[PDB]
Amino acid sequence: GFESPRPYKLTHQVVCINNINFQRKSVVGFVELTIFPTVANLNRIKLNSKQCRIYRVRINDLEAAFIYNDPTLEVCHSESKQRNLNYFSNAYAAAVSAVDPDAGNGELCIKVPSELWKHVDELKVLKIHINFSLDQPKGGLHFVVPSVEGSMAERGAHVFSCGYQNSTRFWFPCVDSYSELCTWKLEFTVDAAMVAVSNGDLVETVYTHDMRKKTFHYMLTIPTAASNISLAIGPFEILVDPYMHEVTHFCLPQLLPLLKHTTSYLHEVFEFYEEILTCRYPYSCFKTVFIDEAYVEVAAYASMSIFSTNLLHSAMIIDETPLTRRCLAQSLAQQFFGCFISRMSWSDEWVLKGISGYIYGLWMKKTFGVNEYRHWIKEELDKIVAYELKTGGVLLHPIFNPASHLHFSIKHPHTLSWEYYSMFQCKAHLVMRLIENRISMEFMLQVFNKLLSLASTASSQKFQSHMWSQMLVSTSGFLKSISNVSGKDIQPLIKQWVDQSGVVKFYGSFAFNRKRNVLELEIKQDYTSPGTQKYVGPLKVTVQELDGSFNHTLQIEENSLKHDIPCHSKSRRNKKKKIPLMNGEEVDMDLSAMDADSPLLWIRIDPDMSVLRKVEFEQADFMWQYQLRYERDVVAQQESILALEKFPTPASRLALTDILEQEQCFYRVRMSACFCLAKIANSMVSTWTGPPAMKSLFTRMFCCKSCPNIVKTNNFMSFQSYFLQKTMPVAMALLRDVHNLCPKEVLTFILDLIKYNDNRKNKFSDNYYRAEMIDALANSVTPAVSVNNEVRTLDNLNPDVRLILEEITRFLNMEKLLPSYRHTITVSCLRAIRVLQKNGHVPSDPALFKSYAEYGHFVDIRIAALEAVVDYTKVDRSYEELQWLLNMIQNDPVPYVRHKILNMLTKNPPFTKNMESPLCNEALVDQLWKLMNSGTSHDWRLRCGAVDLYFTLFGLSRPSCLP
């Protein structure tokens, strides 16, 4: 049951936009809402509006009086001397709650005229006509206007609606909540050479009487929220999908072949999401818009998605096809379960984020294989256990503070840190995988189909929300639908992993009792760390003995420590028979390293990742080597690679080398075995016999049979030896001699890989392989032996580093004339120049990176150069570079770059709270408090980034470096 927090119900909204002026960056328009009051004596009506100048408001064609105030413009007063962050977080939460449409509130308060009170008490319709104007928007609509001359379509100027969550208040007045569903009528009067893309279906396109402008009329009969309404106006090249004909793809001019190749996969994503769920795609059209200077890499609205143009690749670009493919896939998953089925509160957001991430993981499983699915699930689980042990924990479904261990309030999406938002979505889809583990996948897809079917029976009624609230899901409704389809309720699993905000830590060690033939496990939990919680459920453990692989369920109550499980025979060591594996197959194992008295070959605690856990198991090194070689699970091979770094014995070198030589191993395991072999080789110097590690293996796999030092000409058509070939010198460059310097046998090998590179014969590009070659050249740089702080000049350069510097100069200059796909070699060469500057080789001068961080460059070059400037101002304690970065945060045209500068200055801070630095003035505290209070008031993501930066630099209490 859904009861509105608003005293009115909104039925229909007309959004008309005229006079989109690109020179002046200005729009004019009106908005006409059709509300039905649910309570008599409505009097004031409270709507949401930011940055719009409200000209006039007429209610039922009668002139009404409005008052506007935004408390989130300046959160705390300018003349308050408070400088602690808990004060700002409480004031910011109160300010966002005072404009919240999820309460009854709002920023624009319109007073109902007196003569309509007899129209409002007996509950009859009210039609509110606001007309507004955006004079030069700092948020919401982003105007990308290039400085080439010509007409606005000839130079490539466009507008798009940017922002996250409820940010539609930034470009027209609305009820900007996900729970106020209404039908829509959208008119946009644009130039005759431009096209206006929006939500709904385009009913017509009429000309103006001078035929210089045309009006696009859109209609949206599926009741969506105001937060799902978008806009993209530009000189877009239109491409109808040749497979599905209601799907149109819009790109920027001159990028039509890239659009043709890139969006050619999307029909398979549509077919997948419509056959695992049994509902068809709910909207009547689908539109993909590719734009420049995007807010996020992929945004999903109702019947529309806005991607950045940096996803567009051609047919000869690999290492970008899977990333763009999965961006399209998660946009479509959010089309199903973020835009059609919406949110009932700010709680129950974990339901939608979990269903979107879970069905996108099912797509990844079918498309890229179960092994890529397991690797992705393991990397997401490692991400969340790292974040939750780092700071507190992520609390899905809080109850309204519920989480006081962290420096922001979790009551609203616009007060969350961006890393918390990312980990929120990550934990939501892992908890949905856990619900699939308890209640099987076919019942899970039946739950999702029941939600979609209730929403689509709801979506066709005309009753104003008598039935339109069946399109809003809640937690209680989701659990009730689960209990309807399965008969089991998941309330212990919901109580543990949703309502409780923690992950578990397992420390395991075994001992084999030879007398009674049992395996005594010893599993203890660390439950006193700040991020942890105590697990009391069951726990699966998989033991591989000589007779095969056996699963055991252990009951781990609070007082439990020793778990005795039984062991089988050892009669497959009496005769040589094959040892049967986890799957149905069996292999020949070399049992010379195994103990004579124990049959068990390896043990895995929680193999299926059925809890949110971090396992620290103490096996013997031969058990880790057997688990690396003969396991049929990629997460166990990865964890054995990760645990073999502590055992540098030559049997582990043989194990990793046999993994590296082995095709029919998953390629991301061999790419990890490269770096593990490099670390082991560095640890057993003065024992290593022959050549450096992986060199003979590289010449055996990727070089000519007649010439060992000449590499084969590039043929990248295998896509697994391409990735292994481009990752093996990067790990090989981490080799070090007894003198702690990279050997001149590996550096010469990398330089010969660079010289003899011929790419005139493959059908694929070479930009990522050459960029990884520059990364391998950067990995070999050891710190220089400066004497008496000698100035680093050209004559006293290292003889090794002069070759590296010549190569990166040649590569960067050739990129200036023949550019790569996304300037990957510019990014790699800037990263390598920063590596050479971090050691004492090149003079520590930020002027090159400051010239590459200007506005007109590509955004990857910009963020690489700004990363180099952030690293410089951390190491050299530069005041003027920090003022340069803070000025670039305040006034840069691209808001993604501002968010990225705040992000990089949070990750690599110039000082922490513990450090005494020269950059701990009252002036810097006043600048960052002014940046939290004012200055970042237009983005909701820059303000949370400024809160994160103030927390990283000065902590939760009063800045110490202050009177």
């Binding site: 290039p146 001159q254 890239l258 420049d292 996304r822 007109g856």
Partner: peptide, 25 residues
């Protein structure tokens, strides 16, 4: 300037056209 000269970075008015577009096709 004699040893290791770098061509100076010039800003483009539209950078995606010189980044994303293929030149040999």
């Amino acid at each position: 300037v004699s040893t290791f000269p770098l061509i100076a970075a010039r800003p483009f008015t539209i950078p995606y056209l010189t980044a994303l577009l293929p030149s040999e096709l």
